[PDB]
Enzyme design. Structure first.
Site, PDB file in Angstrom:
ATOM      1  N   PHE A 149       0.791  -1.226   0.000  1.00 52.58           N
ATOM      2  CA  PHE A 149       0.000   0.000   0.000  1.00 52.58           C
ATOM      3  C   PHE A 149       0.828   1.282   0.000  1.00 52.58           C
ATOM      4  N   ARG A 150       2.145   1.146   0.112  1.00 49.78           N
ATOM      5  CA  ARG A 150       3.005   2.325   0.075  1.00 49.78           C
ATOM      6  C   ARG A 150       3.090   2.836  -1.372  1.00 49.78           C
ATOM      7  N   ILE A 170       0.649   5.497  -6.394  1.00 51.66           N
ATOM      8  CA  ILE A 170       0.068   5.664  -7.718  1.00 51.66           C
ATOM      9  C   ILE A 170      -0.684   4.390  -8.107  1.00 51.66           C
ATOM     10  N   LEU A 174     -10.468  -5.203   2.836  1.00 55.92           N
ATOM     11  CA  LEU A 174     -11.344  -5.784   3.846  1.00 55.92           C
ATOM     12  C   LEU A 174     -11.129  -4.973   5.123  1.00 55.92           C
ATOM     13  N   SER A 175     -12.212  -4.636   5.817  1.00 55.58           N
ATOM     14  CA  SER A 175     -12.123  -3.832   7.038  1.00 55.58           C
ATOM     15  C   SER A 175     -12.204  -4.608   8.354  1.00 55.58           C
ATOM     16  N   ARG A 197     -12.730  -3.153  11.204  1.00 52.31           N
ATOM     17  CA  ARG A 197     -13.695  -2.529  12.088  1.00 52.31           C
ATOM     18  C   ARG A 197     -15.116  -2.784  11.609  1.00 52.31           C
ATOM     19  N   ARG A 232       2.617   1.481 -16.036  1.00 51.19           N
ATOM     20  CA  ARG A 232       3.783   2.269 -15.655  1.00 51.19           C
ATOM     21  C   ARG A 232       4.071   2.106 -14.170  1.00 51.19           C
ATOM     22  N   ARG A 274       9.724  -4.458  -5.831  1.00 49.28           N
ATOM     23  CA  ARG A 274       9.309  -5.657  -5.114  1.00 49.28           C
ATOM     24  C   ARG A 274       9.811  -6.976  -5.715  1.00 49.28           C
TER      25      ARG A 274
HETATM   26  C1  LIG Z   1      12.089  15.019 -24.809  1.00 44.87           C
HETATM   27  C2  LIG Z   1      10.636  14.895 -24.375  1.00 44.87           C
HETATM   28  C3  LIG Z   1       9.622  14.609 -25.401  1.00 44.87           C
HETATM   29  C4  LIG Z   1       8.212  14.484 -25.041  1.00 44.87           C
HETATM   30  N1  LIG Z   1       7.280  14.223 -26.066  1.00 44.87           N
HETATM   31  C5  LIG Z   1       5.900  14.108 -25.769  1.00 44.87           C
HETATM   32  C6  LIG Z   1       4.872  13.852 -26.809  1.00 44.87           C
HETATM   33  O1  LIG Z   1       5.144  13.720 -28.001  1.00 44.87           O
HETATM   34  N2  LIG Z   1       3.494  13.763 -26.375  1.00 44.87           N
HETATM   35  C7  LIG Z   1       3.108  13.912 -24.999  1.00 44.87           C
HETATM   36  O2  LIG Z   1       1.920  13.827 -24.695  1.00 44.87           O
HETATM   37  N3  LIG Z   1       4.052  14.150 -24.048  1.00 44.87           N
HETATM   38  C8  LIG Z   1       5.425  14.257 -24.367  1.00 44.87           C
HETATM   39  N4  LIG Z   1       6.413  14.525 -23.334  1.00 44.87           N
HETATM   40  C9  LIG Z   1       5.860  14.672 -21.958  1.00 44.87           C
HETATM   41  C10 LIG Z   1       6.021  13.293 -21.239  1.00 44.87           C
HETATM   42  O3  LIG Z   1       5.152  12.356 -21.860  1.00 44.87           O
HETATM   43  C11 LIG Z   1       5.653  13.485 -19.731  1.00 44.87           C
HETATM   44  O4  LIG Z   1       4.317  14.000 -19.630  1.00 44.87           O
HETATM   45  C12 LIG Z   1       6.630  14.485 -19.038  1.00 44.87           C
HETATM   46  O5  LIG Z   1       7.969  14.020 -19.138  1.00 44.87           O
HETATM   47  C13 LIG Z   1       6.292  14.642 -17.565  1.00 44.87           C
HETATM   48  O6  LIG Z   1       6.899  13.481 -16.842  1.00 44.87           O
HETATM   49  P1  LIG Z   1       6.487  12.483 -15.796  1.00 44.87           P
HETATM   50  O7  LIG Z   1       5.312  11.688 -16.143  1.00 44.87           O
HETATM   51  O8  LIG Z   1       7.637  11.592 -15.549  1.00 44.87           O
HETATM   52  O9  LIG Z   1       6.223  13.370 -14.548  1.00 44.87           O
HETATM   53  P2  LIG Z   1       5.128  13.692 -13.487  1.00 44.87           P
HETATM   54  O10 LIG Z   1       3.808  13.827 -14.211  1.00 44.87           O
HETATM   55  O11 LIG Z   1       5.459  14.881 -12.649  1.00 44.87           O
HETATM   56  O12 LIG Z   1       5.205  12.422 -12.689  1.00 44.87           O
HETATM   57  C14 LIG Z   1       6.406  12.006 -11.849  1.00 44.87           C
HETATM   58  C15 LIG Z   1       6.364  10.476 -11.476  1.00 44.87           C
HETATM   59  O13 LIG Z   1       5.124  10.064 -10.866  1.00 44.87           O
HETATM   60  C16 LIG Z   1       4.657   9.145 -11.882  1.00 44.87           C
HETATM   61  N5  LIG Z   1       3.302   9.222 -12.197  1.00 44.87           N
HETATM   62  C17 LIG Z   1       2.532  10.392 -12.073  1.00 44.87           C
HETATM   63  N6  LIG Z   1       1.352  10.154 -12.427  1.00 44.87           N
HETATM   64  C18 LIG Z   1       1.192   8.864 -12.812  1.00 44.87           C
HETATM   65  C19 LIG Z   1       0.145   8.017 -13.294  1.00 44.87           C
HETATM   66  N7  LIG Z   1      -1.087   8.505 -13.462  1.00 44.87           N
HETATM   67  N8  LIG Z   1       0.452   6.654 -13.583  1.00 44.87           N
HETATM   68  C20 LIG Z   1       1.738   6.114 -13.416  1.00 44.87           C
HETATM   69  N9  LIG Z   1       2.812   6.843 -12.959  1.00 44.87           N
HETATM   70  C21 LIG Z   1       2.506   8.225 -12.663  1.00 44.87           C
HETATM   71  C22 LIG Z   1       5.960   8.365 -12.412  1.00 44.87           C
HETATM   72  O14 LIG Z   1       6.870   7.526 -11.666  1.00 44.87           O
HETATM   73  C23 LIG Z   1       6.579   9.751 -12.785  1.00 44.87           C
HETATM   74  O15 LIG Z   1       7.918   9.715 -13.361  1.00 44.87           O
HETATM   75  C24 LIG Z   1       7.759  14.647 -23.600  1.00 44.87           C
HETATM   76  C25 LIG Z   1       8.808  14.933 -22.594  1.00 44.87           C
HETATM   77  C26 LIG Z   1      10.202  15.060 -22.933  1.00 44.87           C
HETATM   78  C27 LIG Z   1      11.168  15.358 -21.790  1.00 44.87           C
HETATM   79  C1  LIG Z   2     -15.209   6.328   7.924  1.00 45.41           C
HETATM   80  C2  LIG Z   2     -14.228   5.745   6.915  1.00 45.41           C
HETATM   81  C3  LIG Z   2     -14.382   4.332   6.504  1.00 45.41           C
HETATM   82  C4  LIG Z   2     -13.460   3.728   5.539  1.00 45.41           C
HETATM   83  N1  LIG Z   2     -13.645   2.369   5.188  1.00 45.41           N
HETATM   84  C5  LIG Z   2     -12.770   1.741   4.264  1.00 45.41           C
HETATM   85  C6  LIG Z   2     -12.899   0.313   3.863  1.00 45.41           C
HETATM   86  O1  LIG Z   2     -13.768  -0.433   4.299  1.00 45.41           O
HETATM   87  N2  LIG Z   2     -11.937  -0.202   2.914  1.00 45.41           N
HETATM   88  C7  LIG Z   2     -10.885   0.608   2.358  1.00 45.41           C
HETATM   89  O2  LIG Z   2     -10.094   0.105   1.549  1.00 45.41           O
HETATM   90  N3  LIG Z   2     -10.764   1.913   2.729  1.00 45.41           N
HETATM   91  C8  LIG Z   2     -11.651   2.516   3.653  1.00 45.41           C
HETATM   92  N4  LIG Z   2     -11.490   3.910   4.036  1.00 45.41           N
HETATM   93  C9  LIG Z   2     -10.337   4.609   3.382  1.00 45.41           C
HETATM   94  C10 LIG Z   2     -10.896   5.436   2.180  1.00 45.41           C
HETATM   95  O3  LIG Z   2     -11.355   4.535   1.185  1.00 45.41           O
HETATM   96  C11 LIG Z   2      -9.748   6.347   1.622  1.00 45.41           C
HETATM   97  O4  LIG Z   2      -8.659   5.519   1.184  1.00 45.41           O
HETATM   98  C12 LIG Z   2      -9.214   7.329   2.706  1.00 45.41           C
HETATM   99  O5  LIG Z   2     -10.265   8.158   3.203  1.00 45.41           O
HETATM  100  C13 LIG Z   2      -8.125   8.227   2.130  1.00 45.41           C
HETATM  101  O6  LIG Z   2      -8.791   9.237   1.257  1.00 45.41           O
HETATM  102  P1  LIG Z   2      -8.619   9.821  -0.128  1.00 45.41           P
HETATM  103  O7  LIG Z   2      -8.636   8.826  -1.198  1.00 45.41           O
HETATM  104  O8  LIG Z   2      -9.694  10.809  -0.335  1.00 45.41           O
HETATM  105  O9  LIG Z   2      -7.257  10.549  -0.043  1.00 45.41           O
HETATM  106  P2  LIG Z   2      -5.868  10.622  -0.744  1.00 45.41           P
HETATM  107  O10 LIG Z   2      -5.474   9.207  -1.133  1.00 45.41           O
HETATM  108  O11 LIG Z   2      -4.836  11.317   0.087  1.00 45.41           O
HETATM  109  O12 LIG Z   2      -6.270  11.456  -1.933  1.00 45.41           O
HETATM  110  C14 LIG Z   2      -6.724  12.915  -1.863  1.00 45.41           C
HETATM  111  C15 LIG Z   2      -7.536  13.330  -3.156  1.00 45.41           C
HETATM  112  O13 LIG Z   2      -6.807  13.051  -4.368  1.00 45.41           O
HETATM  113  C16 LIG Z   2      -7.660  12.017  -4.941  1.00 45.41           C
HETATM  114  N5  LIG Z   2      -7.009  10.930  -5.542  1.00 45.41           N
HETATM  115  C17 LIG Z   2      -5.747  10.450  -5.155  1.00 45.41           C
HETATM  116  N6  LIG Z   2      -5.435   9.473  -5.875  1.00 45.41           N
HETATM  117  C18 LIG Z   2      -6.400   9.187  -6.792  1.00 45.41           C
HETATM  118  C19 LIG Z   2      -6.631   8.243  -7.843  1.00 45.41           C
HETATM  119  N7  LIG Z   2      -5.717   7.312  -8.114  1.00 45.41           N
HETATM  120  N8  LIG Z   2      -7.854   8.326  -8.584  1.00 45.41           N
HETATM  121  C20 LIG Z   2      -8.830   9.293  -8.321  1.00 45.41           C
HETATM  122  N9  LIG Z   2      -8.702  10.249  -7.326  1.00 45.41           N
HETATM  123  C21 LIG Z   2      -7.469  10.167  -6.575  1.00 45.41           C
HETATM  124  C22 LIG Z   2      -9.173  12.454  -4.613  1.00 45.41           C
HETATM  125  O14 LIG Z   2      -9.876  13.628  -5.067  1.00 45.41           O
HETATM  126  C23 LIG Z   2      -8.802  12.498  -3.095  1.00 45.41           C
HETATM  127  O15 LIG Z   2      -9.878  12.899  -2.201  1.00 45.41           O
HETATM  128  C24 LIG Z   2     -12.327   4.541   4.937  1.00 45.41           C
HETATM  129  C25 LIG Z   2     -12.204   5.957   5.372  1.00 45.41           C
HETATM  130  C26 LIG Z   2     -13.104   6.564   6.321  1.00 45.41           C
HETATM  131  C27 LIG Z   2     -12.857   8.030   6.672  1.00 45.41           C
HETATM  132  O1  LIG Z   3     -11.933   3.751   8.986  1.00 41.05           O
HETATM  133  C1  LIG Z   3     -11.234   3.177   8.189  1.00 41.05           C
HETATM  134  N1  LIG Z   3     -10.100   3.861   7.621  1.00 41.05           N
HETATM  135  C2  LIG Z   3      -9.164   3.365   6.670  1.00 41.05           C
HETATM  136  O2  LIG Z   3      -8.242   4.064   6.267  1.00 41.05           O
HETATM  137  N2  LIG Z   3      -9.436   1.956   6.245  1.00 41.05           N
HETATM  138  C3  LIG Z   3      -8.563   1.237   5.236  1.00 41.05           C
HETATM  139  C4  LIG Z   3      -7.222   1.074   6.072  1.00 41.05           C
HETATM  140  C5  LIG Z   3      -6.711  -0.353   5.635  1.00 41.05           C
HETATM  141  O3  LIG Z   3      -5.983  -0.244   4.408  1.00 41.05           O
HETATM  142  C6  LIG Z   3      -7.959  -1.221   5.362  1.00 41.05           C
HETATM  143  C7  LIG Z   3      -8.541  -1.966   6.638  1.00 41.05           C
HETATM  144  O4  LIG Z   3      -8.804  -1.045   7.747  1.00 41.05           O
HETATM  145  P1  LIG Z   3      -9.402  -1.437   9.132  1.00 41.05           P
HETATM  146  O5  LIG Z   3      -9.028  -2.808   9.506  1.00 41.05           O
HETATM  147  O6  LIG Z   3      -8.882  -0.464  10.127  1.00 41.05           O
HETATM  148  O7  LIG Z   3     -10.846  -1.345   9.075  1.00 41.05           O
HETATM  149  O8  LIG Z   3      -8.925  -0.172   4.873  1.00 41.05           O
HETATM  150  C8  LIG Z   3     -10.595   1.281   6.832  1.00 41.05           C
HETATM  151  C9  LIG Z   3     -11.457   1.808   7.735  1.00 41.05           C
HETATM  152  F1  LIG Z   3     -12.515   1.084   8.206  1.00 41.05           F
END
Ligand SMILES: Cc1cc2nc3c(=O)[nH]c(=O)nc-3n(C[C@H](O)[C@H](O)[C@H](O)COP(=O)(O)OP(=O)(O)OC[C@H]3O[C@@H](n4cnc5c(N)ncnc54)[C@H](O)[C@@H]3O)c2cc1C
Ligand SMILES: Cc1cc2nc3c(=O)[nH]c(=O)nc-3n(C[C@H](O)[C@H](O)[C@H](O)COP(=O)(O)OP(=O)(O)OC[C@H]3O[C@@H](n4cnc5c(N)ncnc54)[C@H](O)[C@@H]3O)c2cc1C
Ligand SMILES: O=c1[nH]c(=O)n([C@H]2C[C@H](O)[C@@H](COP(=O)(O)O)O2)cc1F
Ligand SMILES: Cc1cc2nc3c(=O)[nH]c(=O)nc-3n(C[C@H](O)[C@H](O)[C@H](O)COP(=O)(O)OP(=O)(O)OC[C@H]3O[C@@H](n4cnc5c(N)ncnc54)[C@H](O)[C@@H]3O)c2cc1C
Ligand SMILES: Cc1cc2nc3c(=O)[nH]c(=O)nc-3n(C[C@H](O)[C@H](O)[C@H](O)COP(=O)(O)OP(=O)(O)OC[C@H]3O[C@@H](n4cnc5c(N)ncnc54)[C@H](O)[C@@H]3O)c2cc1C
Ligand SMILES: O=c1[nH]c(=O)n([C@H]2C[C@H](O)[C@@H](COP(=O)(O)O)O2)cc1F
Ligand SMILES: O=c1[nH]c(=O)n([C@H]2C[C@H](O)[C@@H](COP(=O)(O)O)O2)cc1F
Ligand SMILES: O=c1[nH]c(=O)n([C@H]2C[C@H](O)[C@@H](COP(=O)(O)O)O2)cc1F
Lengths: 215, 216, 220, 216
Positions: free
Chosen positions: D78-79, D82, D88-89, D91, D166, D175
Site C-alpha cells: 500500500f506504500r 500511484i 477488507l475492514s 472494524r 507504468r 518488489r
Molecule cells: C524530450 C521529451 C519529449 C516528449 N514528447 C511528448 C509527446 O510527443 N506527447 C506527450 O503527450 N508528451 C510528451 N512529453 C511529456 C512526457 O510524456 C511526460 O508528460 C513528461 O515528461 C512529464 O513526466 P512524468 O510523467 O515523468 O512526470 P510527473 O507527471 O510529474 O510524474 C512524476 C512520477 O510520478 C509518476 N506518475 C505520475 N502520475 C502517474 C500516473 N497517473 N500513472 C503512473 N505513474 C505516474 C511516475 O513515476 C513519474 O515519473 C515529452 C517529454 C520530454 C522530456
Molecule cells: C469512515 C471511513 C471508513 C473507511 N472504510 C474503508 C474500507 O472499508 N476499505 C478501504 O479500503 N478503505 C476505507 N477507508 C479509506 C478510504 O477509502 C480512503 O482511502 C481514505 O479516506 C483516504 O482518502 P482519499 O482517497 O480521499 O485521499 P488521498 O489518497 O490522500 O487522496 C486525496 C484526493 O486526491 C484524490 N485521488 C488520489 N489518488 C487518486 C486516484 N488514483 N484516482 C482518483 N482520485 C485520486 C481524490 O480527489 C482524493 O480525495 C475509509 C475511510 C473513512 C474516513
Molecule cells: O476507517 C477506516 N479507515 C481506513 O483508512 N481503512 C482502510 C485502512 C486499511 O488499508 C484497510 C482496513 O482497515 P481497518 O481494519 O482499520 O478497518 O482499509 C478502513 C477503515 F474502516
C-alpha cells in the site's frame, strides 16, 4: 509544538513552509496581481471550492501511533511518508493499551478493566515470542509477524494544506475510528496555529466533518 | 534569487522548506554529524531510496512562454497556479527567439528576417486581441488569437524528488532548448539550497546530458 | 461513440475497463463480501455516492481520444489525476485547423461590431499566422520554433485515460457554468459517454455528489 | 482471469484488464499525428519507448487485481501511492482465522538455536492465542475495531488493486527484487507473470531495457 495522543503516542510539528499569505500569493498570480482584502480572498477561495492555492502551504509532522492507526493514515496518497522499519530495526516494547473509558457506551460481558488486561496479556506474550525468535536466530522481518496491530510505530508525514483538509474531513469525523480521530484533532490544532485564516475559513465553508465544530 | 531566462522570462525562488538534512531526518525518522549525514544522502541516492527527498519542498515563481508552460505543466506531481487569460487582460509580452537560436540550422532567410516575421504576426495578433476586447468581446474568447509565444506567469511548488525527475527530463538535450534554459535555472537554485542532494543526484541518479557538462 | 464538439473538435471513447459492478465488487471486499443481486448492488452504488465513499469508483477506468483547441486542452490538462498523450508540435507538422467561434458564441454580450465581424477578424489572424508558420518551416526553421507564432485556437489531439472518481471531479468542475463555454461543451460529451457506460454510478452522482449546475438542466 | 496461489493461504487473482501492448502504441503514436501500423514497427516502438524512458504511453494499460496477503505484506504494498485500493475492514467485519505461517524452508540459510519446526510451532501458538482473545473480546461485547488490535501482523487481509502498467513496472522494480522482503517478492513474481501474459511485448521490453530488479 508537540501533542500527546492515546497512551504513548504523539504528533509533533517538524517543519512548515508558508502561511495563510502563501495561499493568497499563489492565488493572486491569476489576476496578474492588505490583511483585510487578503483574508477575504481566503474565504472566497474556500467558499467557491478553489483549493489549489492552499497546496502551496506544506507541513512535515513526526507521528507516533499504533500500526492499525497508521494503516488508515497511510491510505492518504497525496502526501509523503517515511516510517520505522520492522525488518531493519528491533521494535520497541511499546503498544497501545486502550483505557477503560474507551469501552464506555458499550455493555460488555466483562468489566472494561478486564478488557485492558486481556489486551496487555496478548501484547506481553507476543512480544516475548518475538524476542525469543530473534535470539533464536530468526531474522527480524520474520520474527515481527507475531506482533499485534497495536504496536507503536513512528513516521514523518509531509502534506500540503489541501490534502491536509481532506484528511481532516475524513479523520476528524465521528465515522472514523476514535483512535485516529484523536490524532486528527491534534493535526487540526497545529494547522489552526500556523494558518488561522485558512483554518477558520475551512471550518466555516468547507469542513465536512462533525467533531471539529464541537471541540 | 531571481534568474532571467530567454528575452523576458525568469525563475524566482519564493519559498523553501528544509535542506539536505530534511531528507536525512526523514530517512532516519528522527527529530549533528556532517560526514555521516552526507554519506547517507549519497547512500539513499545510489540505491534508489528516493522517498526521503520528498520532504524537501520548493515554491518558484516563473514567467515563461505558453509553449514552454505547456510542457512544464505535464509534470503532474507538483502544484501550479497560473495567470488567467479569461480573468485578466494579457500583457504585450512575447518571446522572440534570439538571432543565435537558429544558429546551427540550414536556414534560407537571415536571423533578422525570422525575428521580423515572428515579431510581425505577434504585433498583429495582439492588436486584434485588444480590438476585440474594446468591442465588448469577452476576454476568454478574445485571447484565442494570441500566439503560443505569449508570456504567462505561475507559481510552482514541488518537492525535491519530483524536481529531480524534472531535471532528468528537462535539463537534457532532448527537451526543447527553451525549457532547458529554465531547467538550468531551477538546477542552480536547487544546488544552492541542497548542495549534498544535488551532488549525489548528478553522481548517481541524473539521467540527463547537460548538467554534467555545464556548471551549476 | 464519436461526439462532435465545436466546429472541428470531438470526443471519442477508445476503451473502458469495468462498469457499475466493478465499483460494487471493489466496495464489497470491505465487509468480506462479493456481488449479490442487481437490486442490492445498485443500491450500494447510490449508498456509496451519498456517503462520500469515492474510492470504489476508481476501479472504473476510461480512455478517450480528444480533439480540441489548445486553450481548451490547457485547462483540461490541469487535471493531474489522469494520463495524457498529445500530438507534438515539436515532432509533427501541425495541420490547418482552428476553432472559429460561431456567431451565436457572443449572444448575450452587447458588442460594438457584428458577430460576423468578430468571425472574420479571428480567421484573419489564423490565416496570417498559419501562413507565417509554413514560411518559417519552408525557410528551414525547425518545427518547434516555427509553431510559436500559431494562435491558441489551433486544434490539438490527445488520448486521456482517467478513472471514474477523477472523471467525476472533472465533471464537477468543467460541466459547470463557471468553466469556459468551450470546455463545458466537451464536459457534456464526457458526461454522456460516462452515463452510457455507468448509468447507475452516473445517476447516483447527479443526485448525491455532483456539485456543478448544467448537468441538472441539460439532458444526458 | 488468472489466479496464482502465494505463500500458504494467499493468492493474486486478475480481475480485469484494459488495453494491451497496442494501447501504448496508439497513445504514443498520437505524438506524430499517427496511429497503429504493422506488427514489426509497432513492437519496435515499444522497445524504443522503454529504452529511452518514454513511460507515459504505458499508463494507458490498466489492471485490476484481487489479492489475499498477510497484513505486513499489504502494508508494504500500500506504500505504492500511484494506484487504487479497496481492502477488507477490521472494524466492519469479523476477521477470519487465517494466518501466514512460515514454512520450515523460510529459515533457509539461517542457523537457528531451536529447530525451524519449533519456530513454526511457536508462531502458530501465539497466533492461536491472539485469535482466541480476539473472539473472546468480540463475544464479550467489545467493538470489532478495538478487539482486532490484538491480532498479529501475519493475519491475512484481502484487497482490490487497480494499477496502470507504468506504476506496475515501478512496483516490480522495487518488489521483484532480492532487497524486498521475500514474502512480497513472491507476490511480485505472480504479478509479473500475469503482466507478461497480458502484455508480452511491453513485459519483454521492460525486462530487457528498464527492469532494475534482480530476480525476474
Ligand atoms: C524530450 C521529451 C519529449 C516528449 N514528447 C511528448 C509527446 O510527443 N506527447 C506527450 O503527450 N508528451 C510528451 N512529453 C511529456 C512526457 O510524456 C511526460 O508528460 C513528461 O515528461 C512529464 O513526466 P512524468 O510523467 O515523468 O512526470 P510527473 O507527471 O510529474 O510524474 C512524476 C512520477 O510520478 C509518476 N506518475 C505520475 N502520475 C502517474 C500516473 N497517473 N500513472 C503512473 N505513474 C505516474 C511516475 O513515476 C513519474 O515519473 C515529452 C517529454 C520530454 C522530456
Ligand atoms: C469512515 C471511513 C471508513 C473507511 N472504510 C474503508 C474500507 O472499508 N476499505 C478501504 O479500503 N478503505 C476505507 N477507508 C479509506 C478510504 O477509502 C480512503 O482511502 C481514505 O479516506 C483516504 O482518502 P482519499 O482517497 O480521499 O485521499 P488521498 O489518497 O490522500 O487522496 C486525496 C484526493 O486526491 C484524490 N485521488 C488520489 N489518488 C487518486 C486516484 N488514483 N484516482 C482518483 N482520485 C485520486 C481524490 O480527489 C482524493 O480525495 C475509509 C475511510 C473513512 C474516513
Ligand atoms: O476507517 C477506516 N479507515 C481506513 O483508512 N481503512 C482502510 C485502512 C486499511 O488499508 C484497510 C482496513 O482497515 P481497518 O481494519 O482499520 O478497518 O482499509 C478502513 C477503515 F474502516
Ligand atoms: C471555473 C474555474 C476557474 C479556474 N481558474 C484558474 C486560475 O485562475 N489559475 C490556475 O492556475 N488554475 C485555475 N483553474 C484550474 C484549477 O486551479 C485546477 O487546476 C483544476 O480545476 C483541476 O482540478 P483539481 O486540482 O481538483 O484536479 P486534479 O488535478 O485532477 O486533482 C483531483 C484531486 O486530487 C487532488 N490533488 C491532486 N494533486 C494534488 C496535490 N498535489 N495536492 C493536494 N491535492 C491534490 C484533490 O483532492 C483534487 O480535487 C480553474 C478551474 C475552474 C473549474
Ligand atoms: C528494499 C526496500 C526497503 C524500504 N524501506 C523503507 C523504510 O525503512 N521506511 C519507509 O517508510 N519506507 C520504506 N520502503 C518503501 C519506499 O520508501 C516506497 O514507499 C515504496 O517503494 C513505494 O514506492 P514509490 O514511491 O516509488 O511508489 P509510488 O508511491 O507508487 O509512486 C510511483 C512514482 O510516482 C512518484 N511519486 C508518487 N508520489 C510522489 C510524491 N508525493 N512526490 C514525489 N514523487 C512521487 C515517483 O516518481 C514514484 O517512483 C522500502 C521499499 C523497498 C523496496
Ligand atoms: O518536449 C516535449 N515536452 C512536453 O512536455 N510535451 C507535451 C506538452 C504538450 O502537452 C504536448 C505537445 O507539446 P509540443 O507541441 O511542445 O511538442 O506534449 C511534448 C514535447 F515534445
Ligand atoms: O477556467 C479555467 N480553467 C483552467 O484550467 N485554468 C488554468 C489553465 C491554465 O493553466 C491557466 C490559465 O488559463 P486561462 O488563460 O484559460 O484562463 O490556468 C484557468 C481558467 F480560468
Ligand atoms: O521493504 C520494505 N517495504 C515497505 O514498503 N516498507 C514501508 C512499509 C511500512 O509503511 C513501513 C515499515 O515496514 P516494515 O516493518 O515491513 O519494514 O515502511 C518498509 C520496508 F522495509
Amino acid at each position: 509544538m508537540k501533542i500527546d495522543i492515546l497512551d504513548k503516542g504523539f504528533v509533533e510539528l517538524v517543519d512548515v513552509m508558508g502561511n495563510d499569505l502563501s495561499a493568497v500569493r499563489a492565488a493572486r498570480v491569476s489576476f496578474d496581481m492588505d490583511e483585510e482584502r487578503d483574508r477575504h480572498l481566503i474565504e472566497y477561495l474556500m467558499k467557491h471550492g478553489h483549493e489549489t492555492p492552499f497546496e502551496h502551504i506544506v507541513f512535515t509532522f513526526h507521528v507516533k501511533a499504533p500500526i492499525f492507526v497508521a494503516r488508515q493514515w497511510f491510505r492518504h496518497r497525496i502526501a509523503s511518508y517515511n516510517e520505522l522499519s520492522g525488518r531493519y530495526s528491533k521494535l520497541s516494547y511499546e503498544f497501545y493499551i486502550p483505557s477503560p473509558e474507551r469501552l464506555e457506551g458499550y455493555k460488555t460481558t466483562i468489566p472494561p478493566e478486564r478488557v485492558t488486561e486481556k489486551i496487555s496479556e496478548i501484547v506481553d506474550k507476543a512480544y516475548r515470542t518475538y524476542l525469543e525468535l530473534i535470539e533464536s536466530g530468526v531474522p527480524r522481518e520474520v520474527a515481527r509477524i507475531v506482533l499485534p496491530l497495536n504496536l507503536y510505530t513512528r513516521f514523518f508525514w509531509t502534506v500540503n494544506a489541501r490534502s491536509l483538509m481532506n484528511f481532516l474531513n475524513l479523520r476528524a469525523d465521528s465515522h472514523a475510528q476514535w483512535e485516529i480521530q484523536q490524532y486528527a484533532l491534534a493535526i487540526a490544532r497545529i494547522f489552526k496555529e500556523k494558518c488561522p485564516w485558512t483554518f477558520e475559513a475551512f471550518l466555516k465553508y468547507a469542513y465536512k466533518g462533525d467533531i471539529l465544530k464541537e471541540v
